[PDB]
């Protein structure tokens, strides 16, 4: 079949700027289509026959290409343009899509608003103990979270989870959850959450003593 | 001639009222004659089929009454022609073309009885022939009949009333008024000089003829093919290729029909007894094939919807194609009264269908339906053989009502009619008139 | 409008089989070709097959014999897809799509919302909802961050709102991580201190696969 | 004669290969030119509405920038004609018809720029004129251009290449290949003597032009009417009567178009400045009516689907008919570049629809749809005025795809073309050539 | 090609009801549809017609909203709303597809019919009692069975035997009205080798109450 | 509106006869249609446009007429042609149906087949008791039933019901239903229905004693 390797898998750009994503093939292809995907929403047909726009597509988009190097371009980008773009071809059979190109807003760097939470009096009755740490609303996304128990490292039993980029303020968020049993939780006294970012060299520490 | 023109320009479209009313009665009579002719043909095909039921136990007697019942009707038809009207043989369009050239007589007191009953025997016996042959000649002579009866004079009335009858005759054979008029304008008018044929009068006669058909034929269509798919622009090149195939077969097929006219004549020499006996074997072959392989016989209208629906295997289509080429030459070249027009539509449908089945499997990215190539090929043999592409295209259109295929139909017709020219072929009807006019002089 | 609404997805055990249904509305469902496309978790789109309006031709991707089976009921205005001998690789979001073209190079005209198909040996399990209130040494100030932990459920999805959809601003719901055949996710709301604990902040969780609806109030501690 | 005939038959249909290839390039160029022409008109109609939005607050300034924006474009078109190419006024079909008779010159170095840009002003300002006028003449001249450039000789190549360009021009204006070729065969070829116009070459040029049109216009049809009802045999007499009304109105309308050419000539005498200012007032009238009553202005293609679905009241239809009769004469008789062919389609549709509304109420046992008479009347003025009935029928067919109405369409057309004859009318295009050639010898 | 009308039954006088006829088996649009009705034992009477686009809607000489005819070409369904219903409105309502020949229109295909009963009574389902030969199966070459359908309202009920398997040998008798309730009987005749060896069941269906009964014939003992 | 009147409301014929029924109109009508309604069936389009047969109508049917009078003829009627026939016009709006022509078949004599049925155990539980008596497959339609309880004669509480003429064998059937309470039914002993018909000089009498 016909491998369509979209080139910039992830990319960032600020509004009012020019974006150009690509699409390459192992054999020659004719008249490529492009679909835009917002997460939680069906794909929409955006550009067909290399260059033609669809009824409703703002004219700031533009496709071009030939042979084996097609492209999608946004002269002056906007915020409602953040999504995922897949190049699809049916010049040969069967048809093939691309891996996708994720396009995200770029903004001023932000520091995370860190929160730490003890296990509820209701989980402990079940014998479980999850310590949840929230790192909310920050940019960029590359971040490090670090768990300390009574001033000591702990790398086992931790589950992190990042969000997709935010609708409004276009920041991020993350949750680090340290799950233990009710008994291990009661052997120790302090629980701290260390966030290593880029907006500072001194990590943000949030902690609580079980008393 | 600038001053001459101004007089003619200001006098345009002033057909004499006498020609108009007489074209009205011509169309009315031609419609009734074409209706009655078709009812007769169908009625004889019933009896022949109903007779095969009374003998469906004794299979040898079955195959024997199939051959004999059709040979009698075939012989009866050949005899009526050789004995009373030799110019009612074959199609009859070349004779009507001659008559418009003022080079052949319209012996209507002879042809009307002979051609009518002659066709009933050949068509009703199940020979591979069309009704349009008969109905066009019948309609032309009928136009002459009212010219003589009412003693209208002039070149206009003589050429007009002959033309309207011939157009009304083709319309009534296909329920295709627009194709009827185009046939006169593009193929049958004198091709090398001006004529006084009144177009408005041909219209009146075609209307009246078409109305007569609808009174006795409504609710049932000759060819029902449904609504097929559309044709994307990136598919057009496939229809041009199909036309190029038709462009080489067209002339090759014209050679064979002409060539087999000669070879079958060697068999009987021209003797009214050997000739009629020769037509009895061909007519008996068809009534037999009509039972043991229906698609090899008959006008072919029945197999057109079946082929377009992809209901035939590739094997059968190739089979059907060869068989029907054989049975068409044998029947038409033998001299029986009846056309070659309708059998050529079936050949184009079948051949087109096969091309589509191959194209469908070579290009799955095109999302093809083989039927669209059957419709484009239906009128392609017409364009390659008789070289009247504008008549075929609008005729096929009128019968299948799939206007979204006008572009591939037009491209297939051009490829056919271009490659027939460049491979040295001739319009079949023009080539038959030519050979008729060349023997009606070499007898001096 | 033009609406493709596909259904029939959920959880099936390996080696089993399912039949997805796609409901068309808003156009003449005949005359069009339909198609199926699936998207694995965190991957790209992949074509399954296509079917013409009269079911005379049905193309499939290069993948296994009686694996996929596509059919249409034009009278019902409905498209179907059967998957047999289902592996974990068939765990994906399945897209219903109508086909069309311009110059003749076909594209995927209008898509449906989608149907999710999870292929796991694990069993449907309801969620336990735990409130995350700030500890007794809390940082009493402007915006207070609250939360609720939805733990140990299968399969996806769960839905987390706040005050029945009132508190939409400042809500972060996180993707769910899998661990030992159960899912876990957390949700966060950031509200002004004038609101909490003054008013009442509630976490509404719904897990329809186990018929679970529950509201969890976030009350302060000690 | 029988000697000559046998020789001619065996040499029939052998168009020179040189003529065929040149017909292919003729249609290719005519398609692009006709495509670009329509895109130009639309681009100019765009600007006019976008300007009315920036000034949609001051309704008095609104109505004024509608008049002014259209008067300027009209004047630009009138000026380009009188100054550089006087025979590029009006339709242009009579000019090409003359050229095939070898009685009028094809000044392609003059007409191509003038007609093209002239029409953009008149058509883009919203005047009641058709695109076919330009594209037929533009298309004919283009066929002459490649005859001259490639120095092909003979009556055939001169008559053929001119004919295919004109047919290719009509096709691209309606997306109607069959109507393009039939128009050459029935109306535009020399009507009183044999000619060597090759039909096979007209085909090639019409295809290539139509392919060019489909590349820039696909998925959207000029006129979409859906599938209408059928016509029972006992209803046919209603269509013959409708044609008879068109048969008496045809010549009456031919008088007015010819007569108002004369009356409007008195206004300016022939002076390029009074003329252009008059064309600026007619072009401005349309841009005003085009906003305050759109159906009274424009080519009329937009009001055909609305009328055919019975979506207009009887009151509105008669207004539209009267209004559009006025604005059609005022625009075409003024001499502006553009056809009268298409505006006569709108006239037939509107008139038929009104007739159908009466038939619905007079004969409820027939279960009629007014749309079927709109389709039969659409091409009926064509049948009565220009007297090309076979072309009108196949043109309406190709644009409306309602073949089940072929019989009532043909009966309406015959009643029109029969009663126009019997009421003493002439083919308008032939009658305009007549008046043009009568000034060329006085 | 099938037309299946519904919605009929019992309505209080002066009231209103909405019958529905669902078409299937043909291009439902591009076809005029009509309503005809037949009073009990009386003749046919046109009610109305409607074109595909619901632009033209013609009624018999009636009042304002006496009859209201509509269609839903998406559901392929025809409707008919009757209002201020009265005695002369009790009839059998036929859905009918329209067409023409030379041009004079006719009712091409009709449907089974739905029954409307104007009355102040009560929709009562039937009691089905089986009828088997008494303490003397005087076995000739054949035997006659039956069921008795008593106490239902309104009309009609349909009686079949073995879901339509036993076709020949069946007589169903017209209902009789007494005390504002209907009663009928069905009469099947089967060979003696086929009973009680094989099974004979009586299948009563009363649509007005959505009730079906499948009673089996027991030999008395 | 046009008033179509059909000549005989009822007519009888023996198969092989030439049946003819007329439809007359108050003013001139043209191209009328005929519908056949067999007992228990929706009407079927039979003859349309005065003399055209619908698909599958046997050739023994034909239509005719003009202006005021129109006729439908059966040249050699058959027993299966028993129905009610309606004419209809739509040459004038509003269209109108005729009154119907009921065609009854005459045939050879057929004697009835009497069956008598005691109350069911189920109906005895519900309080009532219906004694049912079937008289099946006889010709002519004229028949006289007659009930007797322990020798006496009962005429109170008897309901008879007649089927229409059969479409194939042209016979008639009847059912007599003696309805009594559980009490009155049990204070008597022997029940009998007596069938008196033309085919016999001595009545057919079937009986059952409650024990
Ligand atoms: Cl011949
Ligand atoms: Cl022929
Ligand atoms: Cl002009
Ligand atoms: Cl024009």
Structural domains of chain F ordered from first start: 4-105 (2.60.40.10), 113-209 (2.60.40.10)
CB pairs under 8 A between E and F: 130
Q: Do chains C and F touch (3 or more CB pairs under 8 A)?
A: no
Same domain, C11 and C107: yes
- Looking at residue D234, the DSSP 8-state letter turns out to be G
- Report the DSSP beta bridge partners of residue B257: none
Residue at which a domain ends, from C99, C119, C139: C119
Number of H-type helices and E-type strands within chain F? 2, 18
Between CA A11 and CA A6 the distance in angstroms is 12
Long-range contacts of the stretch D312-318 (C-beta < 8 A, 24+): D312/D353, D314/D354, D314/D357, D317/D350, D317/D353, D317/D354, D317/D357, D318/D354
Q: How close B395 gets to chain C, by Cα (Å)?
A: 25
Q: Do the chains contact at C112 and A116, CB–CB below 8 Å?
A: no
Which experimental approach was used here?
X-ray
| Secondary structure (DSSP) of D206-220 | HHHHHHHHHHTTTT-
For residue A123, whether the previous peptide bond is cis, meaning omega lies within 30 degrees of 0, is no
Q: Do chains C and B touch (3 or more CB pairs under 8 A)?
A: yes
For residue E154, whether the previous peptide bond is cis, meaning omega lies within 30 degrees of 0, is yes
Q: Do the chains contact at E55 and D310, CB–CB below 8 Å?
A: yes
Same domain, E98 and E134: no
CATH number of the domain within which C11 lies: 2.60.40.10
Between CA F71 and CA E29 the distance in angstroms is 34
Q: How many CB atoms lie within 10 A of CB B89?
A: 21
Residue at which a domain ends, from C119, C147, C164: C119
Question: And the tokens for E25?
Answer: 């088996």
Q: Which of A72, A76, A75, A94 is nearest to A85 (CA)?
A: A72
Q: Are A114 and A137 in contact (CB under 8 A)?
A: no
Residue E221 placed within a domain: no
Alpha helix segments (H runs only) across D85-131: 93-100, 108-124
Q: Are B430 and B251 in contact (CB under 8 A)?
A: no
Same domain, C133 and C34: no
Between CA F128 and CA B206 the distance in angstroms is 79
In three-state secondary structure terms, A194 is: strand
Q: How many CB atoms lie within 10 A of CB B226?
A: 12
The residue of F28, F35, F42 whose CB has the most chain E CBs within 10 angstroms, and thus the best one to mutate to test that interface, is F42
Same domain, C93 and C155: no
Longest dimension (CA), chain A: 69
CA distances from B372 to A198, B227, B235, C11, D203 (A): 65, 10, 11, 44, 21
CA distances from E39 to B253, E19, E89, E91, F70 (A): 69, 16, 8, 4, 25
Between CA C220 and CA C148 the distance in angstroms is 13
Q: What per-residue string of b and e applies to B274-307 under the rule 16 or more CB within 10 Å gives b?
A: ebbebbbebbbbbbbbbbeeebbbbbbbebbbbb
- Looking at residue F139, the DSSP 8-state letter turns out to be B
Q: What is the distance of C-alpha D46 from the center of its chain?
A: 23
Give the chain D residue nearest F30 (alpha carbons).
D234
Nearest ligand to the CA of D388 is: 4
Q: Are C56 and C40 in contact (CB under 8 A)?
A: no
Q: How much is the CA Rg of chain E, to the nearest whole Å? A: 21
Same domain, E87 and E191: no
Contacts of E113 in chain F (CB under 8 A): 42
- Looking at residue A98, the DSSP 8-state letter turns out to be B
Q: Are A29 and A68 in contact (CB under 8 A)?
A: yes
Q: Which of A199, A174, A169 is nearest to A82 (CA)?
A: A169
Same domain, E108 and E140: no
Question: The dihedral of CA D126, D130, D132, D134: what is its sign?
Answer: negative
Domain count along chain E: 2
Q: Are B205 and B170 in contact (CB under 8 A)?
A: no
CA distances from D78 to B444, D132, D249, D296 (A): 69, 18, 30, 22
Q: Are D149 and D182 in contact (CB under 8 A)?
A: no
Q: Are A164 and A39 in contact (CB under 8 A)?
A: yes
Burial (CB count within 10 angstroms: exposed 0-12, middle 13-18, buried 19+), residue D165: buried
What is the residue range of C83's domain?
A: 3-119
Q: What is the distance of C-alpha D279 from the center of its chain?
A: 20
Q: How close D368 gets to chain E, by Cα (Å)?
A: 9
Question: The dihedral of CA F118, F121, F124, F128: what is its sign?
Answer: negative
Is the minimum CB–CB distance between D233 and chain F shorter than 8 Å? no
Q: What per-residue string of b and e applies to B340-360 under the rule 16 or more CB within 10 Å gives b?
A: bbbbbbbbbbbbbbbbbbebb
Write the CB contacts of F168 (distance below 8 Å, at least 6 apart in sequence). F79, F80
Question: And the tokens for B56?
Answer: 């469906």
Residue E160 placed within a domain: yes
Write the CB contacts of C130 (distance below 8 Å, at least 6 apart in sequence). A119, A120, A122, A123, A130, C148, C149, C151, C216
Question: And the tokens for B201?
Answer: 């009068």
Contacts of A91 in chain B (CB under 8 A): 365
Question: The dihedral of CA B314, B319, B322, B324: what is its sign?
Answer: negative
- Report the DSSP beta bridge partners of residue E118: E11
Between CA C47 and CA C37 the distance in angstroms is 4
Q: Are D414 and B204 in contact (CB under 8 A)?
A: yes
User: What's the 3-state SS for C84-102?
Assistant: ECCCHHHCEEEEEEEEECC
Torsion of CA D120, D122, D124, D129, to 10 degrees: -110
Q: Which of B65, B64, B148 is nearest to B108 (CA)?
A: B148
Query: Quick one: chain B helix, strand, coil %, rounded to 5?
Result: 75, 0, 25
Between CA D203 and CA D172 the distance in angstroms is 13
- Looking at residue B188, the DSSP 8-state letter turns out to be I
Burial (CB count within 10 angstroms: exposed 0-12, middle 13-18, buried 19+), residue B262: exposed
Same domain, E83 and E152: no
Between CA D426 and CA D429 the distance in angstroms is 9
Q: Do the chains contact at F91 and D364, CB–CB below 8 Å?
A: no
Question: The dihedral of CA D407, D410, D416, D418: what is its sign?
Answer: negative
Question: And the tokens for B437?
Answer: 């006019």
* Among the partner residues D101, D177, D218, nearest to B410 by beta-carbon distance: D177
CA distances from C37 to B271, C45, C92 (A): 73, 7, 10
Torsions phi, psi of B136, nearest 5? -70, -50
Same domain, C180 and C78: no
In three-state secondary structure terms, A96 is: strand
Residue at which a domain ends, from E118, E143, E177: E118
Contacts of B219 in chain E (CB under 8 A): 101
* Among the partner residues D232, D364, D369, nearest to E100 by beta-carbon distance: D232
Same domain, E84 and E105: yes
Element (H, E) at D73: helix D59-84
Q: Are F87 and F72 in contact (CB under 8 A)?
A: yes
Contacts of C102 in chain D (CB under 8 A): 218-219
Q: Which of B358, B332, B352 is nearest to B413 (CA)?
A: B352
Same domain, C104 and C67: yes
Nearest ligand to the CA of B183 is: 2
Element (H, E) at C143: strand C143-153
CA distances from D228 to D372, D401, D413 (A): 7, 9, 19
Residue B171 alpha carbon to ligand 2 centre in Å: 13
Torsions phi, psi of E87, nearest 5? -60, -50
Between CA F174 and CA F141 the distance in angstroms is 9
Q: Are D91 and D340 in contact (CB under 8 A)?
A: yes
Residue E135 placed within a domain: yes
Question: And the tokens for D61?
Answer: 């300034």
């Amino acid at each position: 079949d016909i491998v369509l390797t979209q080139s910039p898998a992830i990319m960032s750009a600020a509004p009012g700027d020019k974006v150009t994503m690509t699409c390459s093939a192992s054999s020659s292809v004719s008249y490529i289509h492009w679909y835009q995907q917002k997460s939680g929403t069906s794909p929409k047909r955006w550009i067909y026959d290399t260059s033609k726009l669809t009824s409703g597509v703002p004219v700031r988009f533009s496709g071009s290409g030939s042979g084996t190097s097609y492209s999608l371009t946004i002269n002056t980008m906007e915020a409602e343009d953040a999504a995922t773009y897949y190049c699809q071809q049916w010049s040969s059979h069967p048809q093939t899509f691309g891996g996708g190109t994720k396009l995200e807003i770029l903004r001023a760097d932000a520091a995370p608003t860190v929160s730490i939470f003890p296990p509820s009096s209701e989980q402990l009755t079940s014998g479980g103990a999850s310590v949840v740490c929230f790192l909310n609303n920050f940019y960029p996304k590359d971040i490090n979270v670090k768990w300390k128990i009574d001033g000591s490292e702990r790398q086992n039993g931790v589950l992190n989870s990042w969000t997709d980029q935010d609708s409004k303020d276009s920041t991020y968020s993350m949750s680090s959850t340290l799950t233990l049993t009710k008994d291990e939780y009661e052997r120790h006294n302090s629980y701290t959450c260390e966030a290593t970012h880029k907006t500072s060299t001194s990590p943000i520490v949030k902690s609580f003593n079980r008393a | 001639r600038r001053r001459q023109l101004i007089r003619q320009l200001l006098e345009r479209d002033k057909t004499p009222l006498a020609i108009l009313f007489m074209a009205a009665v011509v169309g009315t009579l031609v419609g009734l004659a074409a209706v009655a002719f078709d009812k007769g043909v169908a009625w004889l095909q019933n009896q022949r089929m109903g007779a095969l039921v009374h003998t469906a136990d004794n299979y040898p007697l079955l195959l024997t009454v199939a051959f004999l019942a059709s040979a009698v009707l075939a012989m009866f038809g050949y005899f009526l022609v050789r004995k009373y009207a030799p110019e009612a043989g074959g199609s009859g369009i070349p004779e009507i073309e001659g008559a418009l050239e003022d080079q052949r007589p319209v012996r209507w007191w002879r042809v009307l009885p002979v051609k009518f009953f002659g066709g009933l025997g050949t068509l009703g016996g199940g020979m591979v022939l069309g009704r349009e042959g008969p109905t066009v000649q019948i309609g032309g002579n009928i136009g002459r009949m009212v010219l003589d009866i009412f003693r209208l004079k002039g070149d206009e009335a003589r050429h007009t009333l002959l033309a309207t009858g011939a157009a009304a005759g083709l319309a009534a054979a296909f329920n295709a008024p627009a194709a009827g008029i185009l046939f006169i304008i593009e193929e049958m008018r004198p091709q090398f000089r001006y004529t006084l044929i009144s177009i408005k009068a041909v219209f009146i006669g075609v209307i009246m003829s078409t109305i007569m058909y609808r009174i006795f034929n409504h609710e049932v269509a000759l060819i029902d093919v449904g609504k097929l798919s559309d044709a994307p622009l990136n598919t057009l090149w496939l229809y041009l290729i199909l036309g190029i195939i038709f462009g080489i077969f067209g002339p090759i097929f014209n050679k064979w029909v002409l060539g087999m006219q000669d070879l079958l004549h060697r068999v009987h020499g021209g003797n009214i007894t050997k000739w009629v006996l020769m037509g009895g074997a061909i007519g008996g072959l068809c009534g037999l094939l009509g039972f043991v392989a229906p698609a090899t016989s008959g006008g072919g209208f029945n197999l057109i919807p079946i082929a377009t629906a992809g209901n035939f295997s590739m094997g059968m289509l190739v089979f059907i194609f060869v068989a029907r080429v054989i049975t068409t030459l044998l029947c038409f070249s033998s001299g029986a009264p009846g056309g070659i027009f309708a059998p050529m539509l079936a050949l184009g449908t079948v051949l087109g269908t096969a091309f589509g089945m191959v194209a469908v499997e070579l290009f799955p990215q095109y999302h093809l339906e083989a039927g669209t190539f059957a419709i484009a090929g239906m009128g392609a043999l017409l364009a390659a053989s008789i070289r009247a592409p504008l008549t075929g295209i609008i005729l096929v259109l009128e019968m299948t009502d799939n206007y979204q295929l006008i572009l591939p139909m037009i491209i297939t017709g051009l490829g056919a009619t271009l490659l027939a020219q460049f491979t040295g072929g001739k319009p079949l009807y023009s080539a038959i008139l030519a050979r008729t006019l060349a023997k009606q002089e070499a007898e001096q | 409008e033009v609406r493709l609404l596909e259904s029939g997805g959920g959880l099936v055990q390996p080696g089993g089989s399912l039949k997805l249904s796609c409901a068309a509305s808003g156009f003449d469902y005949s005359r069009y070709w339909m198609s199926w496309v699936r998207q694995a978790p965190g991957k790209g789109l992949k074509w399954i097959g296509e079917i013409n309006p009269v079911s005379s031709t049905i193309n499939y991707t290069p993948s296994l014999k009686d694996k996929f089976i596509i059919s249409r009921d034009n009278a019902k205005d409905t498209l179907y897809l059967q998957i047999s001998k289902v592996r974990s690789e068939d765990t994906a979001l399945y897209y219903c799509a109508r086909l069309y073209y311009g110059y003749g190079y076909w594209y995927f005209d209008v898509w449906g919302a989608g149907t999710t198909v999870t292929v796991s040996s694990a069993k449907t399990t309801p969620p336990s909802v735990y409130p995350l209130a700030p500890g007794s040494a809390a940082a009493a100030a402007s915006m207070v961050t609250l939360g609720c932990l939805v733990k140990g459920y299968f399969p996806e999805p769960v839905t987390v709102t706040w005050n029945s959809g009132s508190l939409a601003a400042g809500v972060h719901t996180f993707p769910a991580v899998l661990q030992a055949a159960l899912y876990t996710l957390s949700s966060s709301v950031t509200v002004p201190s004038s609101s909490w604990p003054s008013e009442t902040v509630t976490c509404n969780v719904a897990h329809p696969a186990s018929s679970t609806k529950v509201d969890k109030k976030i009350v302060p501690r000690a």
